[PDB]
Design a protein. Sequence first.
Lengths: 44, 44
Amino acid sequence: MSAMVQIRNVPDELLHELKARAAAQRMSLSDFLLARLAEIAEEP
Amino acid sequence: MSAMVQIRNVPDELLHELKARAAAQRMSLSDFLLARLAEIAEEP
């Protein structure tokens, strides 16, 4: 099973930087963030 | 100025791992993920 996760108080500048990084990898913001969080969780 | 981010279909296994990491650092999941998003955005 799975759930939608909401991150509050993301500053405008930060959100635009993340959207640019997602687009550079030719991904949705959600897909990009999911993949990075999965990489973070996989390392000690 | 601030914005909501939505991450869809975070698998339970991964969400449990993130919640544990946030709690270990005495942070809300949202504040922990805001810190990680800022690290992602910062790197070359």
